[PDB]
């Protein structure tokens, strides 16, 4: 029960943040294809 | 006085038995450490059980300890 | 052992055979050999140094995911972000660690604090990875 | 997807934590705290959804 | 007399076997702690076993204590 | 007499060795607890190996007590 | 004389009991290593419980030393 | 003779060694419980090595036993 | 002499307690091996713990032998 | 002969060293069971190190036993 | 002859103590075994510090053995 679990952050949030971190450490030589294929696009529509 | 010799030697031999009490308290405390680390949620219940084991071995140590105390006072 | 190490975008090992693997996990890293006991551990920001059947051992940083050691001795290592080491800037990793710590205090909520701690931990594991 | 002309509809199962941590089938799996299943399922849900999106 | 002291010497040497009982009790009531921490959903069976082990090892502890007190008072 | 005192010493010493058997019972039972928590679907075999280990520890304990009761009363 | 001889024998067979406390602290700190390796997010609580275990285990150990000391100095 | 009393004393003191074998068997069989719980599919070889360890700890137990009767009954 | 013979007996007896300190030290270092093979990213802290424990347990066994060597000549 | 009484007493007292060896070896091979269970394809290396530990525990054990045996016969 | 016997008795009561170091050695070497079972990638480090633990407990074993010989031969 790591710290972020009792914080309420779902494990997907943790993976999102770790992946974003490892992306920010990528060289801008590769940030080209890192930035694309990375961003989320889906919007939500409620009931 | 061989009576006093027996009293003191017996008290010294009886007080050693608390080695089991020492090992038991140590292993119980270590087990509580591991249990809290793995599952911090049940901290309270685990600590209660640890205190129970603590006391239930302290009583067995107090058995020999009180034997020695009784020898010291009475016999 | 049938190893399969993959990322949402690219596949490194597909049913490939490698002798020994060194995976991180949410409960401290460990290793995998042919008949390792089945497990369902998830990953932690770290680096997996796959030991090829021969001498070569190749080190891939992984940011999150899931390791499954199979019943039939195989392995599935899925990583949200599996980058080979050279693609990373160690100076940028340390700088990101330092900044993330900088905004550590500016967390009015506990969940925000956990967010900054997550990024900080990942960045520091990166910093150690690149040395 | 199967070929430029061929696509077959499919349905795949999603299991919840209660369903997956109460089966004798996967007792053998070692090191599995009651929490690491929560994380593994939270991740496998997104994982299957992404696979379906691509297909 | 020497034997009026040898009785107590032997009894004091005998009572020390309770170290094993103490250590065993501590080990079992640490295993309880961690077993409950890992898998809380099996608590009642864990405790049912724990009592079995406690009684079954303090039984040998009390065998030692009974040997001692039989040397002391009953013979 | 001195052999009576020697026999008393024999009891007092020889019985102590049973501490190891008691502690071994404790450890094997703690292992029972751990294994049962880990693999509850083997309860029966857990009792099996538990009673096996207990028998193999009471072997040592009863050797201790037999030596005591043979030096003393025989 | 035998009074002094009895005192020396008693101290020798009494100060032994601290071996059990030594095993206890060894187990406590081994479980500390395990508990830290598990969750470094709890270091302060781990330290608290471990020093508590050390205090309340060396306290158990010290009684045989105290018994021997009282027997020697002031009988 | 008094030296027979000394033999009794020595044998009683020696009989404390049994404790090591007792505790060793306890922990070996506990670890066998663990290794058969975590990985049931090695039962066979795990039990083979467990009985090996039982033998080599009963070794200490029985050598203490034999030496106790050798000093007692040379 | 009676009193000096008992001095020697008391010294030899007091210097047994070291067994517990040695066993506990072995436990501490085995546990360091375990907790380090698990999580090799805290090596410094793990060695801090293990050395502090070694010092502590060695010291307590040394207190037992301190009783031994003070009863020897005091 | 009183010195022979001492011979027998000392031999019987110092043959207890096998206790520690028995306990340590039991722990060693239990850990071997666990380690081979977790990672069966290192059984050969695990048994190499297990035999190392066995031999090098019984080494000190029988070292003490041989010192006590030389005490026994050929001092 | 009383001191001659007491010397051997104390020598035995000192050569017993190393049994605990033997148990500790068994513990640390089993720990090496299972730690290498988990994480074979740290063979070098694991063995190198397992041997260090071995020698470090041999320290205390030698400590008691030298105590015994000192009492037996040089007072």
Give F19-71 as a DSSP string: HHHHHHHHHHHHHHHHHHHH-GGGHHHHHHHHHHHHHHHHHHHHHHHHHHHHH
Best residue in E53, E54, E72 for a mutation probing chain F (most F CBs within 10 Å): E53
| CA-to-CA dists, residue G20 to E43, G15, J20, J62, angstroms | 30, 11, 13, 24
DSSP I39: -
Question: In Å, how far is I49's CA from the nearest CA of chain G?
Answer: 7
Owner of token pair 């004389």 = G1
Evaluate whether C67 touches C41 at the Cβ level (below 8 Å).
Answer: yes
Largest CA distance in chain H: 60
CA distance E20 to G58: 19
DSSP E74: I
Is I15 in a helix, a strand, or coil?
Answer: coil
CA distance D49 to D55: 10
Evaluate whether J31 touches K30 at the Cβ level (below 8 Å).
Answer: yes
Evaluate whether C4 touches C59 at the Cβ level (below 8 Å).
Answer: no
3-state DSSP helix/strand/coil % of chain A, to nearest 5: 55, 0, 40
In 3D, which of G46, B67, C14, C12 has the Cα closest to residue C2? Answer: C14
DSSP C20: E
Distance of CA C11 to the CA centre of its chain: 15
Is K17 in a helix, a strand, or coil?
Answer: coil
Evaluate whether I60 touches G22 at the Cβ level (below 8 Å).
Answer: yes
Write the residue in H12, H18, H29 that is nearest to F60 by C-beta: H18
b/e sequence C64-100, b meaning 16+ C-beta within 10 Å = bbbbbbeeebebebbbbbbbeeeebbeebbbebbeeb
DSSP E72: I
Question: In Å, how far is D42's CA from the nearest CA of chain A?
Answer: 6
Owner of token pair 């009953």 = E74
**A31 Cβ partners below 8 Å, 6+ apart?**
A23
The three-point CA angle D3-D6-D7 to 5° equals 110
DSSP C12: E
What φ, ψ does residue D26 adopt, rounded to 5°?
A: -105, 25
**K54 Cβ partners below 8 Å, 6+ apart?**
J56, K25, K28, K29
Best residue in G3, G19, G20 for a mutation probing chain E (most E CBs within 10 Å): G20
The three-point CA angle I55-I59-I63 to 5° equals 180
Evaluate whether J12 touches H9 at the Cβ level (below 8 Å).
Answer: yes
Beta carbons of A22 and C9 less than 8 Å apart: no
CA distance C40 to D14: 17
Give the pairing type, strands C46-52 and C18-23: antiparallel
Contacts of C27 in chain I (CB under 8 A): 38
Owner of token pair 């071997």 = J32
Method: cryo-EM
DSSP H74: -
Is C108 in a helix, a strand, or coil?
Answer: coil
Evaluate whether E60 touches F22 at the Cβ level (below 8 Å).
Answer: yes
Q: How far apart are the first and last CA of chain H?
A: 15
Question: In Å, how far is B74's CA from the nearest CA of chain F?
Answer: 22
Evaluate whether B17 touches E20 at the Cβ level (below 8 Å).
Answer: no
* Nearest chain A alpha carbon to D47: A12
Lay out the sheet containing C30-32: strands in order across: C30-32, C18-23, C46-52, C57-62, C82-84
Distance of CA A47 to the CA centre of its chain: 26
How many CB atoms sit inside 10 A of residue C62's CB?
27
Torsion of the alpha carbons at I43, I44, I47 and I49, rounded to the nearest 10: -110
How many CB atoms sit inside 10 A of residue C34's CB?
15
Q: Is the dihedral of CA G47, G48, G50, G54 positive or negative?
A: positive
| CA-to-CA dists, residue J66 to F27, J6, J59, K11, K19, angstroms | 30, 17, 10, 14, 14
How many CB atoms sit inside 10 A of residue C14's CB?
10
**Please, is D9 exposed, middle or buried when counting C-beta atoms within 10 Å of its C-beta (0-12, 13-18, 19+)?**
exposed
Distance of CA H14 to the CA centre of its chain: 13
* Nearest chain H alpha carbon to J4: H3
In 3D, which of A26, A1, A30, A4 has the Cα closest to residue A15? Answer: A4
Give the pairing type, strands C11-16 and C18-23: unpaired
What φ, ψ does residue C39 adopt, rounded to 5°?
A: -150, 160
Owner of token pair 């109460």 = D22
Which residues of chain J have a Cβ shorter than 8 Å from any chain I Cβ?
20, 23-24
**G24 Cβ partners below 8 Å, 6+ apart?**
B22, B23, B24, B25, B26, B27, B29, E26, G53, G57, G60, G61, I24
CA distance G26 to B67: 28
Evaluate whether F33 touches F50 at the Cβ level (below 8 Å).
Answer: no
**J64 Cβ partners below 8 Å, 6+ apart?**
J14, J17, K15, K18, K19, K65
Evaluate whether J17 touches J61 at the Cβ level (below 8 Å).
Answer: yes
Residues linked to residue C82 through DSSP beta bridges, in sequence order:
C62
Query: DSSP alpha helices (H): ranges in E1-75?
Result: 3-15, 18-38, 43-69
**Please, is E22 exposed, middle or buried when counting C-beta atoms within 10 Å of its C-beta (0-12, 13-18, 19+)?**
buried
Here the tokens at position B28 are 């119980």
Give the pairing type, strands C82-84 and C75-79: unpaired
Here the tokens at position C113 are 């604090």
Evaluate whether J74 touches J21 at the Cβ level (below 8 Å).
Answer: no
In 3D, which of B39, B55, B22, I40 has the Cα closest to residue G28? Answer: B22
DSSP chain D: --BTTB----------HHHHTT-STT-S-BS--TTHHHHHHHHHHHHHHHHHHH-
Looking at domain K1-75, which CATH architecture does it have? Answer: Up-down Bundle (1.20)
Here the tokens at position F27 are 């450890």
Question: In Å, how far is C22's CA from the nearest CA of chain K?
Answer: 7
CA distance C48 to H51: 38
Interface of D with C in 1-55 (CB under 8 A): 26, 28-33, 36-37, 39-40, 43-44, 47, 50
* Nearest chain G alpha carbon to E12: G13
Write the residue in H6, H18, H34 that is nearest to J9 by C-beta: H6
Evaluate whether G72 touches I14 at the Cβ level (below 8 Å).
Answer: no
In 3D, which of G61, J10, C77 has the Cα closest to residue B58? Answer: G61
Evaluate whether E33 touches B49 at the Cβ level (below 8 Å).
Answer: yes
Owner of token pair 């069971």 = J33
Residues linked to residue C59 through DSSP beta bridges, in sequence order:
C49
The upper half-sphere exposure of residue G26, i.e. CA atoms within 13 Å in the direction of its Cβ, equals 34
Give the start-to-end residue ranges of the domains of chain J: 2-73
Question: In Å, how far is I51's CA from the nearest CA of chain C?
Answer: 22
Here the tokens at position C48 are 């997996």
CA distance D46 to C13: 22
CA distance J30 to J53: 12
In 3D, which of F21, I33, D43 has the Cα closest to residue E61? Answer: F21
Element (H, E) at C61: strand C57-62
**C120 Cβ partners below 8 Å, 6+ apart?**
C97, C100, C101, C104
Taking each helix axis as running N to C, give the angle between helix E3-15 and helix E43-69, from 0 to 180 degrees, rounded to the nearest 10. Answer: 170
Evaluate whether D37 touches D19 at the Cβ level (below 8 Å).
Answer: no
E-assigned strand segments in K5-63: none
DSSP A26: B
The three-point CA angle F60-F50-H44 to 5° equals 100
Rg for chain G (alpha carbons), in Å?
18
In 3D, which of C122, E32, D38, I45 has the Cα closest to residue G39? Answer: I45
* Nearest chain J alpha carbon to F27: J27
Element (H, E) at G71: helix G43-74
CA distance F55 to B17: 25
* Nearest chain I alpha carbon to B20: I20
- In the structure, do chain B and chain G come into contact, i.e. share 3 or more CB pairs under 8 Å? yes
Residues linked to residue C65 through DSSP beta bridges, in sequence order:
C79
* Nearest chain I alpha carbon to K35: I34
Rg for chain F (alpha carbons), in Å?
17
Distance of CA H33 to the CA centre of its chain: 19
CA distance A32 to G27: 54
Q: Label residue A37 left, alpha or beta by phi (over 0 means left) and psi (-120 to 50 means alpha).
A: left
Q: Label residue H39 left, alpha or beta by phi (over 0 means left) and psi (-120 to 50 means alpha).
A: beta
Write the residue in H17, H35, H52 that is nearest to J34 by C-beta: H35
How many CB atoms sit inside 10 A of residue J70's CB?
10
What φ, ψ does residue C10 adopt, rounded to 5°?
A: -130, 150
Question: In Å, how far is I60's CA from the nearest CA of chain C?
Answer: 33
CA distance J57 to C82: 46
CA distance I54 to A13: 42
Evaluate whether K9 touches I11 at the Cβ level (below 8 Å).
Answer: no
CA distance E15 to B10: 10
**H66 Cβ partners below 8 Å, 6+ apart?**
none
Q: What counts of helices (H) and strands (E) characterise chain K?
A: 3, 0
CATH topology of domain B2-73: F1FO ATP Synthase (1.20.20)
Any idea how long chain D is?
55
Here the tokens at position A5 are 């679990």
CA distance D52 to E1: 93
**C50 Cβ partners below 8 Å, 6+ apart?**
C3, C5, C13, C18, C20, C21, C22, C57, C58, C59, C60
CA distance E16 to B15: 8
Query: DSSP alpha helices (H): ranges in chain B?
Result: 2-16, 19-38, 43-73
Residues linked to residue C50 through DSSP beta bridges, in sequence order:
C58
CA distance I60 to A7: 43
In 3D, which of E49, F44, I37 has the Cα closest to residue J38? Answer: I37
DSSP C26-45: TT--EEE-TTPPPB-PBP-S
J·K CB contacts under 8 A: 145
CA distance J51 to K8: 34
Evaluate whether E12 touches B10 at the Cβ level (below 8 Å).
Answer: yes
Is B74 in a helix, a strand, or coil?
Answer: coil
CA distance H20 to F17: 8
In 3D, which of C68, C81, C70, C74 has the Cα closest to residue C125? Answer: C81
Element (H, E) at G13: helix G3-14
Evaluate whether C81 touches A18 at the Cβ level (below 8 Å).
Answer: yes
Any idea how long chain J is?
75
CA distance H67 to J66: 12
Write the residue in F21, F30, F36 that is nearest to E28 by C-beta: F30
Is B17 in a helix, a strand, or coil?
Answer: coil
DSSP G33: H
CA distance H38 to C40: 13
How many CB atoms sit inside 10 A of residue I67's CB?
27
């Amino acid at each position: 029960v790591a710290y972020w679990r009792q914080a309420g952050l779902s494990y997907i949030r943790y993976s999102q943040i770790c992946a974003k971190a490892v992306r920010d450490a990528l060289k801008t030589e590769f940030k080209a294809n890192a930035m694309k294929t990375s961003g989320s696009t889906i919007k939500i529509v409620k009931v | 006085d061989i009576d006093t010799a027996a009293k003191f030697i017996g008290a010294g031999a009886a007080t050693v038995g608390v080695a089991g009490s020492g090992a038991g308290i140590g292993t119980v405390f270590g087990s509580l450490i591991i249990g809290y680390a793995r599952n911090p949620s049940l901290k309270q219940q685990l600590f209660s059980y640890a205190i129970l084991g603590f006391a239930l071995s302290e009583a067995m140590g107090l058995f020999c300890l009180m034997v020695a105390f009784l020898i010291l006072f009475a016999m | 052992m049938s190893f399969t190490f993959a990322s949402p975008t690219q596949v490194f090992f597909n049913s490939a055979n490698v002798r020994q693997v060194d995976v991180p996990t949410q409960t401290g890293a460990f290793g995998i050999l042919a008949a390792h006991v089945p497990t369902l551990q998830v990953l932690r920001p770290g680096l997996v140094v796959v030991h090829a059947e021969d001498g070569t051992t190749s080190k891939y940083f992984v940011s999150s995911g899931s390791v499954t050691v199979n019943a039939d001795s195989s392995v599935q290592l899925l990583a949200e972000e599996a980058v080979t080491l050279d693609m990373l800037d160690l100076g940028a990793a340390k700088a990101n660690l330092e900044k993330a710590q900088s905004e550590l205090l500016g967390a009015a909520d506990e969940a925000t604090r956990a967010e900054i701690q997550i990024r900080i931990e990942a960045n520091e594991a990166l910093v150690k990875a690149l040395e | 997807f199967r070929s430029v002309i061929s696509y077959k509809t499919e349905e795949k199962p999603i299991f919840s934590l209660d369903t997956i941590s109460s089966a004798e089938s996967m007792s053998i799996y070692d090191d599995i705290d009651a929490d690491v299943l929560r994380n593994y399922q939270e991740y496998s849900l997104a994982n299957i959804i992404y696979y379906s999106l691509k297909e």
